[PDB]
Amino acid sequence: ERVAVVGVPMDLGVDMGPSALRYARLLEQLEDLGYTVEDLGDVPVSLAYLEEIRAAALVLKERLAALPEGVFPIVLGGDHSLSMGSVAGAARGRRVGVVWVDAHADFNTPETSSGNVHGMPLAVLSGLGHPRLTEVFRAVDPKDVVLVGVRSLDPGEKRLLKEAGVRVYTMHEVDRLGVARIAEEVLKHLQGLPLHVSLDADVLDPTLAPGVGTPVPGGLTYREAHLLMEILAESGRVQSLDLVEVNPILDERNRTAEMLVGLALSLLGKRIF
Amino acid sequence: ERVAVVGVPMDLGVDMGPSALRYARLLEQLEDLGYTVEDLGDVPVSLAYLEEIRAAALVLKERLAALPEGVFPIVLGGDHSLSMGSVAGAARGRRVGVVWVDAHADFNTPETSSGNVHGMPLAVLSGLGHPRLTEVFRAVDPKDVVLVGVRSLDPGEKRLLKEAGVRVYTMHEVDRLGVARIAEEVLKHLQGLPLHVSLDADVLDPTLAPGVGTPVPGGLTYREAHLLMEILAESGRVQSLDLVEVNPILDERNRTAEMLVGLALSLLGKRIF
Amino acid sequence: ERVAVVGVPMDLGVDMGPSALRYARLLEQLEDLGYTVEDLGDVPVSLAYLEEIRAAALVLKERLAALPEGVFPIVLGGDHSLSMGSVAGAARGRRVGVVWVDAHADFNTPETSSGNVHGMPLAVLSGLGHPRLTEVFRAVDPKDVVLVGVRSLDPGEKRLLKEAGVRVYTMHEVDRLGVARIAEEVLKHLQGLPLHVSLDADVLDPTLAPGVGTPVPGGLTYREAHLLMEILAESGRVQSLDLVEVNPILDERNRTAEMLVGLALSLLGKRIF
Amino acid sequence: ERVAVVGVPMDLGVDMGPSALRYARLLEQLEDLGYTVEDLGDVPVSLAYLEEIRAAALVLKERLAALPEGVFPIVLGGDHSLSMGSVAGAARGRRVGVVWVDAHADFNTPETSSGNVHGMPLAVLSGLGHPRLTEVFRAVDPKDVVLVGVRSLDPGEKRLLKEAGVRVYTMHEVDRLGVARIAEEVLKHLQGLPLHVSLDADVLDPTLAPGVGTPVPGGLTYREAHLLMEILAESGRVQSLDLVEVNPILDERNRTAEMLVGLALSLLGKRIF
Amino acid sequence: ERVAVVGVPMDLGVDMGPSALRYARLLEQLEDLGYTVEDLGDVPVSLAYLEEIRAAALVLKERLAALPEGVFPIVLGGDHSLSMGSVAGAARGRRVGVVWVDAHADFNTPETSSGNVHGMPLAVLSGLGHPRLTEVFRAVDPKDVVLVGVRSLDPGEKRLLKEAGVRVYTMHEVDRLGVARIAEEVLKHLQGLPLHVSLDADVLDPTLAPGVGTPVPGGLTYREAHLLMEILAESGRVQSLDLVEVNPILDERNRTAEMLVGLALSLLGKRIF
Amino acid sequence: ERVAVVGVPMDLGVDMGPSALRYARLLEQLEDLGYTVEDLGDVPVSLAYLEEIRAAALVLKERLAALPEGVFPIVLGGDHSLSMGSVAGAARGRRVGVVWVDAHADFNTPETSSGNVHGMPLAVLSGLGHPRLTEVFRAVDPKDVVLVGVRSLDPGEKRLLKEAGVRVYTMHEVDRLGVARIAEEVLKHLQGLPLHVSLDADVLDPTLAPGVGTPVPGGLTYREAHLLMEILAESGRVQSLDLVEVNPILDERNRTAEMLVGLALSLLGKRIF
Ligand SMILES: N[C@@H](CCCC[NH3+])C(=O)O
Ligand SMILES: N[C@@H](CCCC[NH3+])C(=O)O
Ligand SMILES: N[C@@H](CCCC[NH3+])C(=O)O
Ligand SMILES: N[C@@H](CCCC[NH3+])C(=O)O
Ligand SMILES: N[C@@H](CCCC[NH3+])C(=O)O
Ligand SMILES: N[C@@H](CCCC[NH3+])C(=O)O
Ligand SMILES: [Mn+2]
Ligand SMILES: [Mn+2]
Ligand SMILES: [Mn+2]
Ligand SMILES: [Mn+2]
Ligand SMILES: [Mn+2]
Ligand SMILES: [Mn+2]
Ligand SMILES: [Mn+2]
Ligand SMILES: [Mn+2]
Ligand SMILES: [Mn+2]
Ligand SMILES: [Mn+2]
Ligand SMILES: [Mn+2]
Ligand SMILES: [Mn+2]
């Protein structure tokens, strides 16, 4: 019944993502859906910038852990790095499954690689990476993580993912199996666990979502993304959500932000029938 | 072997739809397919406009009912309201299955809703709605009706559809099951019955068919629409067809009209092999 | 030019009907008439027996549907129940008119009645009755059905027939109008449609055709039956035929089977001049 | 989400009530509350005047009955007589509970009494009174009616009310039990039913609402009226509302109209917290 | 249309339950209802007996999973322990709602308690209990389970039920709310899911069903039990059924078995009107 | 103030019902209630027996029609067939509502069915059935009839009841709505009309009233039956009553007759407070 929205304008043009999502009327539409919604505003944001990222993500983690239970958090973001804080915070010390819907795996470590932290959050959350990050953000077991829509990986990432035993559904599996079957398998693999969904806008085909920093051709269609959100919603186990990497500076008429808002609605129960 | 084409330029810019469809060479192409074709011209068209709609639809019903049996009728339209007359007329007092391919259910009543009659034809045909319409247009049992491609419904419509027991395949089912399976299920549900296909241009994704009054994203692809028509055609039970809601004023290079003409050809037997 | 004969020795002594008909030289006489004939042998036959009947009729339906078009099928039978499969199969998914020449209407449902399925085939074909049957055998529309020679009906049957709007020519109409006029009206009522003739031996007066399970006095004379067949033949629209209910165990010198073979020859063009 | 406002400037100076209510910014404030509002304008108004009243109320009934379901109607009025049409029209043929908040019971018949029709609407609605009125306005069972705030009754009225079994909460009961308890009892007595609230401005103490034709001392306080509206709103069952008897000619700075507009907002969800 | 009946004479005198139920003409009456029925015979049955129970339940699970889809399975039993296999098998790997109509919750684990396995099946099915059982029988999410008619619970059970979040309707709720409302709430709570109904004879008042191992006073009346079955039947979502714990050795004239057969008929569509 | 009791010992062991009812001191208790009572004795009684039934019922009709108005008639019976005469006679040519409290609908016609006339009285009274009966006993419009407590119907009866538009409250509705609400709805449905109550002993659960020819489990409880009678009594519109189908030969200590006598007392005003 209750939903809390918090923004993380972190870009360490994605820092404009939270405003774009708000402008796509995420809040008004959540209310039309029957939810009572509260906008918590934005979390202050001031190798590269590791400490600054740590500081911001820490505020986020603490902000989410404070929420009275029963309040569904939706984090609007810039960098996917914010997920280190959102997942750790939203998990509330309990075992949660993570469904990472992204064109990338974000499973790099300082060792595997351009040194961008927003390319290592899922690894950090899994307990792999720089100590200053894992010490406060490790929050999920690699076996309780599922990647969906992946189509671009670094050599080092591939190794780590395999070593860690993370279930990965690349676009190859999406094409081969279909979203309906994959969604079912995702729920089975993470059965009995509350689920945190982290949705990176770049999972959508670039033709549909141009407003992303690292576009990769051959992504999910509008319909597949909605189906995935609908099936995950049906499970009734989704407890939190990240809407990240929206970059209005590369977008067209804010359609990428509008896309993600529509997907959030589907994930929270909006149905045709 | 025989096909009769009649237009209903009713908009009570869709009134330009019949001309657009004729300009897309529906007639010439039906002949290339081996059918002998006759253009019957247009039916005269002069809450909102209920009596005027009733009058026009009545002329249409009578015109179709008077056709010699064995002559396949294709009604070109503006408003989907014309289907009250086309289905009642093409049914010939007989039990017919109705396959409504539309982004909407057109199952509203004066009570459920903007008062537009073109949003109530399927309800009327099923015997629900204003007495002045149901008294002369009721023509199908709700159980012999199947909706395909629906992605937008009003609250009242949902209730009526469930109460009536109408089989509904929304885009969610389309994504989940696939058109092939849905087409098979349609034929099974309406097994042994002649079939009337009512095709609303808006069932197609807006990116593919922009020339429609009420576009709704996430529609059928070009291929899916043809596959549906081809499987229905294989049954050999299709007996009549409506090609409605084409709006050239909102279209681009008449591509929406061309889309529907191609779909009509597939429904009438055109095959790749 | 081509005729295919198939037997259905179903009695769920009419199971001996196919052999009796073959022994009456149906095949040799069809050849003398100029047809190239192929005997397909018999379809395997193993409330009462509904599933067994469904199985056998389904094999029949598939066998007929698989025939190359242009091949006239003649089904020899025991129970008239086989018509659920012969009509559905011979229809080939297209609209066909049914001329049911029988002393009975076979229009009962499980509700209207002794529970014998061979008393419900026409109702099933018309979409009325047990779901397990109508779901695979519904194949004709009530207004495309004409009963000729009826002289015995159950109370429930009368209701269903009137509700369904089936054109019925009982012996009262035969006596009042004459076969010539009735045949003309049958063709008019089913104008433009290919015709399936289902001939039950009991339509003939018992004095002429004793070999039937449920004889009813006051039936058609030898000449009337031949006149009906000859006029239907002249239309050039007859596409399939059932020769059912021949029971050699109750017959005299196989004359009933010989009667039906003679009528089949008239239906297929045999003429005095 | 949707609200429709219609006025009935009937005084057969209360005819100036609709304008006064509109000038109190009822519409603008409903929008600030989040509702989408449509002003339908006024219904034409031309023993005493029974036929003229009937005509106007009939137009009103039809106008409300034609509204798409889901649209909350608020009728602005002069005479409370308009309620014969508003309740009958807003009921939509279904069983509805009526909460009549008035200093009077308006339960007179031509027999019980000054012949003013605006003193008989509730009786008429309950099926008691002149045939010309009950024949088209009877719309509620006396047992689904609850009067709140009554402090002035005619001898005849008392008899009819008791005979009919109408639940009446006079100011004596208000003083004794308190509005909170009375509001709870009202919802219980009319449990499971959609509610129509008819608010007569004279239910409020004259010192607070001087702009009324028949002021009666000892009415509801500002706070009690708002509490009643808030508790009724919490039920989520209120479907329609009448704001009647506002007379600007006897008012002071339009405060009575402003009072009612404030109460309408409370009834529609406005809350301090 | 199709029903398969299988018995599990497990008592590890309830082992005589399957014969008692068959003697109550379950099969003959299902056919009178219009279903085609097949008796699959019985599944071989040879802390306490955990492995033997596991073996039998496994055979049952496989037998049901192997059934062609569309075939409604009814499992006749001795011990309710058989449900570990019937539910897992009937679920067919898909998400199913479970309606457990029992005087007990059968939600014990080896830890919570007399060590009887037939007092732990629902817990096992929910994934709680001995590993040897949960590894092959876990098949439902605690949130998709609803208990109806409970009137006897162990301290440990109460904890587990609350921890798991299982919706429980004890006889207190039944008395307070009424079966009509409870049935509605059950369907809502398990909306959109196929339903498996597990009916324990002891849910019925002992005065009505004496033939049960653990009778508990204050149970459901004959009418309440039929109403529950009728409302669940109306949903059209019931896909499987268990009829367990019938003990003819403690019964009177087999009335408990006859009671359950009647309830099965109501659940499968039998209605007064 | 005045009550007339007449018996109809018709069984064409229910013929012993009138004596059983008298022995239950119906008369003495009616006097204790304040009524002046007169026993008119019994009406002479000499497909099946249609003419004999007609003759007896006719004598009954004439006997009741001849009673001075203001005298409440109570007819004690054997067969419910007597109601053809009691209702027609008690109606006195005026429009009366009929409350048929029975486990059966008695709405059969010679066509719908074992040919027992006592299974067709309500139909006859409604103008459906054998001409010999309807010509002299038709006396009520199907729309002024309400059945309460029904739990057993023949297929044909269902059709006739729906066709005729008779309001039917089966035990399913009783369980769902409760007698209180049903009694209110009965009075509303028959508002403004004098009421004739026909009470068949078999409406009561067999466990409570074993003395009936066709017992059907799941009937009304003692309290429900008294509540129904008390609410009908409160209306003050009940004008006549039949107490039928009491069979002392199948009864236990005349408790069924005592049950009905008690119910008559409640119907005639006996109250606890
Ligand atoms: N509309 C936002 C711009 C996004 C800024 C994020 N820091 C603001 O101007 O407040
Ligand atoms: N070419 C057609 C145009 C279709 C018009 C819509 N009422 C004409 O104007 O004759
Ligand atoms: N001539 C066949 C007899 C068919 C009668 C029924 N199955 C045979 O005996 O081989
Ligand atoms: N303001 C209104 C006056 C109240 C009218 C009521 N009929 C007008 O001048 O339109
Ligand atoms: N009639 C059953 C008896 C059920 C006893 C429990 N195993 C049998 O086949 O012997
Ligand atoms: N005691 C009554 C008995 C009624 C049985 C019905 N004809 C008598 O012999 O007069
Ligand atoms: Mn990412
Ligand atoms: Mn990414
Ligand atoms: Mn449409
Ligand atoms: Mn549309
Ligand atoms: Mn026949
Ligand atoms: Mn026959
Ligand atoms: Mn008033
Ligand atoms: Mn007043
Ligand atoms: Mn149990
Ligand atoms: Mn139990
Ligand atoms: Mn009766
Ligand atoms: Mn009865």
JSON list of N, CA, C and O in Angstrom, two decimals, chain A residues 185-214:
[
{"chain": "A", "resi": 185, "resn": "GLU", "atom": "N", "xyz": [11.85, -19.26, -14.49]},
{"chain": "A", "resi": 185, "resn": "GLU", "atom": "CA", "xyz": [13.09, -19.81, -13.98]},
{"chain": "A", "resi": 185, "resn": "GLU", "atom": "C", "xyz": [13.74, -18.91, -12.94]},
{"chain": "A", "resi": 185, "resn": "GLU", "atom": "O", "xyz": [14.37, -19.39, -11.99]},
{"chain": "A", "resi": 186, "resn": "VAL", "atom": "N", "xyz": [13.61, -17.60, -13.12]},
{"chain": "A", "resi": 186, "resn": "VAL", "atom": "CA", "xyz": [14.17, -16.63, -12.19]},
{"chain": "A", "resi": 186, "resn": "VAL", "atom": "C", "xyz": [13.50, -16.79, -10.83]},
{"chain": "A", "resi": 186, "resn": "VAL", "atom": "O", "xyz": [14.16, -16.83, -9.79]},
{"chain": "A", "resi": 187, "resn": "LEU", "atom": "N", "xyz": [12.17, -16.88, -10.84]},
{"chain": "A", "resi": 187, "resn": "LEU", "atom": "CA", "xyz": [11.41, -17.02, -9.61]},
{"chain": "A", "resi": 187, "resn": "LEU", "atom": "C", "xyz": [11.71, -18.35, -8.91]},
{"chain": "A", "resi": 187, "resn": "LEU", "atom": "O", "xyz": [11.78, -18.41, -7.68]},
{"chain": "A", "resi": 188, "resn": "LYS", "atom": "N", "xyz": [11.89, -19.41, -9.70]},
{"chain": "A", "resi": 188, "resn": "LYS", "atom": "CA", "xyz": [12.21, -20.73, -9.17]},
{"chain": "A", "resi": 188, "resn": "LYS", "atom": "C", "xyz": [13.59, -20.69, -8.52]},
{"chain": "A", "resi": 188, "resn": "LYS", "atom": "O", "xyz": [13.75, -21.12, -7.38]},
{"chain": "A", "resi": 189, "resn": "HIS", "atom": "N", "xyz": [14.57, -20.17, -9.24]},
{"chain": "A", "resi": 189, "resn": "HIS", "atom": "CA", "xyz": [15.94, -20.08, -8.75]},
{"chain": "A", "resi": 189, "resn": "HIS", "atom": "C", "xyz": [16.04, -19.29, -7.44]},
{"chain": "A", "resi": 189, "resn": "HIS", "atom": "O", "xyz": [16.90, -19.55, -6.61]},
{"chain": "A", "resi": 190, "resn": "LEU", "atom": "N", "xyz": [15.15, -18.31, -7.26]},
{"chain": "A", "resi": 190, "resn": "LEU", "atom": "CA", "xyz": [15.15, -17.49, -6.05]},
{"chain": "A", "resi": 190, "resn": "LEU", "atom": "C", "xyz": [13.89, -17.75, -5.23]},
{"chain": "A", "resi": 190, "resn": "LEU", "atom": "O", "xyz": [13.39, -16.87, -4.54]},
{"chain": "A", "resi": 191, "resn": "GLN", "atom": "N", "xyz": [13.39, -18.98, -5.29]},
{"chain": "A", "resi": 191, "resn": "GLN", "atom": "CA", "xyz": [12.16, -19.29, -4.58]},
{"chain": "A", "resi": 191, "resn": "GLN", "atom": "C", "xyz": [12.17, -19.03, -3.08]},
{"chain": "A", "resi": 191, "resn": "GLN", "atom": "O", "xyz": [13.18, -19.23, -2.41]},
{"chain": "A", "resi": 192, "resn": "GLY", "atom": "N", "xyz": [11.03, -18.57, -2.58]},
{"chain": "A", "resi": 192, "resn": "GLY", "atom": "CA", "xyz": [10.88, -18.30, -1.16]},
{"chain": "A", "resi": 192, "resn": "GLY", "atom": "C", "xyz": [11.59, -17.07, -0.64]},
{"chain": "A", "resi": 192, "resn": "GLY", "atom": "O", "xyz": [11.57, -16.81, 0.56]},
{"chain": "A", "resi": 193, "resn": "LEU", "atom": "N", "xyz": [12.22, -16.30, -1.53]},
{"chain": "A", "resi": 193, "resn": "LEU", "atom": "CA", "xyz": [12.94, -15.11, -1.09]},
{"chain": "A", "resi": 193, "resn": "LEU", "atom": "C", "xyz": [12.27, -13.81, -1.52]},
{"chain": "A", "resi": 193, "resn": "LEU", "atom": "O", "xyz": [11.60, -13.76, -2.56]},
{"chain": "A", "resi": 194, "resn": "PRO", "atom": "N", "xyz": [12.41, -12.75, -0.71]},
{"chain": "A", "resi": 194, "resn": "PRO", "atom": "CA", "xyz": [11.81, -11.46, -1.09]},
{"chain": "A", "resi": 194, "resn": "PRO", "atom": "C", "xyz": [12.74, -11.02, -2.21]},
{"chain": "A", "resi": 194, "resn": "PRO", "atom": "O", "xyz": [13.94, -11.33, -2.17]},
{"chain": "A", "resi": 195, "resn": "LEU", "atom": "N", "xyz": [12.23, -10.31, -3.21]},
{"chain": "A", "resi": 195, "resn": "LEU", "atom": "CA", "xyz": [13.06, -9.93, -4.34]},
{"chain": "A", "resi": 195, "resn": "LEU", "atom": "C", "xyz": [13.31, -8.45, -4.55]},
{"chain": "A", "resi": 195, "resn": "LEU", "atom": "O", "xyz": [12.40, -7.64, -4.43]},
{"chain": "A", "resi": 196, "resn": "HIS", "atom": "N", "xyz": [14.56, -8.11, -4.85]},
{"chain": "A", "resi": 196, "resn": "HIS", "atom": "CA", "xyz": [14.92, -6.73, -5.15]},
{"chain": "A", "resi": 196, "resn": "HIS", "atom": "C", "xyz": [15.22, -6.69, -6.64]},
{"chain": "A", "resi": 196, "resn": "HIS", "atom": "O", "xyz": [16.07, -7.44, -7.13]},
{"chain": "A", "resi": 197, "resn": "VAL", "atom": "N", "xyz": [14.52, -5.82, -7.36]},
{"chain": "A", "resi": 197, "resn": "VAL", "atom": "CA", "xyz": [14.73, -5.70, -8.80]},
{"chain": "A", "resi": 197, "resn": "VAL", "atom": "C", "xyz": [15.52, -4.43, -9.10]},
{"chain": "A", "resi": 197, "resn": "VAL", "atom": "O", "xyz": [15.14, -3.35, -8.66]},
{"chain": "A", "resi": 198, "resn": "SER", "atom": "N", "xyz": [16.63, -4.58, -9.81]},
{"chain": "A", "resi": 198, "resn": "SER", "atom": "CA", "xyz": [17.46, -3.43, -10.18]},
{"chain": "A", "resi": 198, "resn": "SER", "atom": "C", "xyz": [17.36, -3.35, -11.69]},
{"chain": "A", "resi": 198, "resn": "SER", "atom": "O", "xyz": [17.87, -4.21, -12.40]},
{"chain": "A", "resi": 199, "resn": "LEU", "atom": "N", "xyz": [16.68, -2.31, -12.17]},
{"chain": "A", "resi": 199, "resn": "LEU", "atom": "CA", "xyz": [16.46, -2.13, -13.59]},
{"chain": "A", "resi": 199, "resn": "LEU", "atom": "C", "xyz": [17.29, -0.99, -14.18]},
{"chain": "A", "resi": 199, "resn": "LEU", "atom": "O", "xyz": [17.09, 0.17, -13.85]},
{"chain": "A", "resi": 200, "resn": "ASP", "atom": "N", "xyz": [18.23, -1.36, -15.04]},
{"chain": "A", "resi": 200, "resn": "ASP", "atom": "CA", "xyz": [19.11, -0.43, -15.73]},
{"chain": "A", "resi": 200, "resn": "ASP", "atom": "C", "xyz": [18.41, -0.19, -17.07]},
{"chain": "A", "resi": 200, "resn": "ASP", "atom": "O", "xyz": [18.06, -1.13, -17.77]},
{"chain": "A", "resi": 201, "resn": "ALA", "atom": "N", "xyz": [18.21, 1.08, -17.41]},
{"chain": "A", "resi": 201, "resn": "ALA", "atom": "CA", "xyz": [17.53, 1.43, -18.65]},
{"chain": "A", "resi": 201, "resn": "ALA", "atom": "C", "xyz": [18.18, 0.83, -19.89]},
{"chain": "A", "resi": 201, "resn": "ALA", "atom": "O", "xyz": [17.50, 0.55, -20.88]},
{"chain": "A", "resi": 202, "resn": "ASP", "atom": "N", "xyz": [19.48, 0.61, -19.84]},
{"chain": "A", "resi": 202, "resn": "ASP", "atom": "CA", "xyz": [20.15, 0.09, -21.02]},
{"chain": "A", "resi": 202, "resn": "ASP", "atom": "C", "xyz": [19.82, -1.34, -21.38]},
{"chain": "A", "resi": 202, "resn": "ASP", "atom": "O", "xyz": [20.27, -1.83, -22.41]},
{"chain": "A", "resi": 203, "resn": "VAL", "atom": "N", "xyz": [19.02, -2.03, -20.56]},
{"chain": "A", "resi": 203, "resn": "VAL", "atom": "CA", "xyz": [18.66, -3.40, -20.91]},
{"chain": "A", "resi": 203, "resn": "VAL", "atom": "C", "xyz": [17.73, -3.36, -22.12]},
{"chain": "A", "resi": 203, "resn": "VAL", "atom": "O", "xyz": [17.69, -4.30, -22.92]},
{"chain": "A", "resi": 204, "resn": "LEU", "atom": "N", "xyz": [16.99, -2.27, -22.25]},
{"chain": "A", "resi": 204, "resn": "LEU", "atom": "CA", "xyz": [16.07, -2.08, -23.37]},
{"chain": "A", "resi": 204, "resn": "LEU", "atom": "C", "xyz": [16.86, -1.79, -24.64]},
{"chain": "A", "resi": 204, "resn": "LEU", "atom": "O", "xyz": [17.92, -1.16, -24.60]},
{"chain": "A", "resi": 205, "resn": "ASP", "atom": "N", "xyz": [16.35, -2.24, -25.78]},
{"chain": "A", "resi": 205, "resn": "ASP", "atom": "CA", "xyz": [17.03, -1.97, -27.02]},
{"chain": "A", "resi": 205, "resn": "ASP", "atom": "C", "xyz": [17.21, -0.44, -27.15]},
{"chain": "A", "resi": 205, "resn": "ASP", "atom": "O", "xyz": [16.31, 0.33, -26.81]},
{"chain": "A", "resi": 206, "resn": "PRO", "atom": "N", "xyz": [18.38, 0.01, -27.64]},
{"chain": "A", "resi": 206, "resn": "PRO", "atom": "CA", "xyz": [18.69, 1.44, -27.82]},
{"chain": "A", "resi": 206, "resn": "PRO", "atom": "C", "xyz": [17.67, 2.18, -28.69]},
{"chain": "A", "resi": 206, "resn": "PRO", "atom": "O", "xyz": [17.45, 3.38, -28.52]},
{"chain": "A", "resi": 207, "resn": "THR", "atom": "N", "xyz": [17.07, 1.47, -29.63]},
{"chain": "A", "resi": 207, "resn": "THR", "atom": "CA", "xyz": [16.08, 2.05, -30.52]},
{"chain": "A", "resi": 207, "resn": "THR", "atom": "C", "xyz": [14.86, 2.48, -29.72]},
{"chain": "A", "resi": 207, "resn": "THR", "atom": "O", "xyz": [14.11, 3.38, -30.12]},
{"chain": "A", "resi": 208, "resn": "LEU", "atom": "N", "xyz": [14.69, 1.85, -28.57]},
{"chain": "A", "resi": 208, "resn": "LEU", "atom": "CA", "xyz": [13.57, 2.10, -27.68]},
{"chain": "A", "resi": 208, "resn": "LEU", "atom": "C", "xyz": [13.97, 3.00, -26.51]},
{"chain": "A", "resi": 208, "resn": "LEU", "atom": "O", "xyz": [13.18, 3.79, -26.01]},
{"chain": "A", "resi": 209, "resn": "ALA", "atom": "N", "xyz": [15.22, 2.86, -26.07]},
{"chain": "A", "resi": 209, "resn": "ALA", "atom": "CA", "xyz": [15.71, 3.64, -24.95]},
{"chain": "A", "resi": 209, "resn": "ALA", "atom": "C", "xyz": [17.07, 4.23, -25.29]},
{"chain": "A", "resi": 209, "resn": "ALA", "atom": "O", "xyz": [18.10, 3.70, -24.87]},
{"chain": "A", "resi": 210, "resn": "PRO", "atom": "N", "xyz": [17.09, 5.34, -26.04]},
{"chain": "A", "resi": 210, "resn": "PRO", "atom": "CA", "xyz": [18.35, 5.98, -26.42]},
{"chain": "A", "resi": 210, "resn": "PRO", "atom": "C", "xyz": [19.04, 6.70, -25.27]},
{"chain": "A", "resi": 210, "resn": "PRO", "atom": "O", "xyz": [20.25, 6.83, -25.26]},
{"chain": "A", "resi": 211, "resn": "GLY", "atom": "N", "xyz": [18.24, 7.15, -24.30]},
{"chain": "A", "resi": 211, "resn": "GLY", "atom": "CA", "xyz": [18.78, 7.87, -23.16]},
{"chain": "A", "resi": 211, "resn": "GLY", "atom": "C", "xyz": [19.55, 7.06, -22.14]},
{"chain": "A", "resi": 211, "resn": "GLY", "atom": "O", "xyz": [19.16, 7.00, -20.97]},
{"chain": "A", "resi": 212, "resn": "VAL", "atom": "N", "xyz": [20.64, 6.44, -22.57]},
{"chain": "A", "resi": 212, "resn": "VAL", "atom": "CA", "xyz": [21.49, 5.65, -21.69]},
{"chain": "A", "resi": 212, "resn": "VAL", "atom": "C", "xyz": [22.96, 5.89, -22.05]},
{"chain": "A", "resi": 212, "resn": "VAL", "atom": "O", "xyz": [23.30, 6.08, -23.22]},
{"chain": "A", "resi": 213, "resn": "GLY", "atom": "N", "xyz": [23.83, 5.88, -21.04]},
{"chain": "A", "resi": 213, "resn": "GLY", "atom": "CA", "xyz": [25.24, 6.13, -21.26]},
{"chain": "A", "resi": 213, "resn": "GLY", "atom": "C", "xyz": [25.96, 5.10, -22.11]},
{"chain": "A", "resi": 213, "resn": "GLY", "atom": "O", "xyz": [26.77, 5.46, -22.97]},
{"chain": "A", "resi": 214, "resn": "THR", "atom": "N", "xyz": [25.68, 3.82, -21.89]},
{"chain": "A", "resi": 214, "resn": "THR", "atom": "CA", "xyz": [26.35, 2.78, -22.66]},
{"chain": "A", "resi": 214, "resn": "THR", "atom": "C", "xyz": [25.35, 1.92, -23.42]},
{"chain": "A", "resi": 214, "resn": "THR", "atom": "O", "xyz": [25.05, 0.79, -23.02]}
]
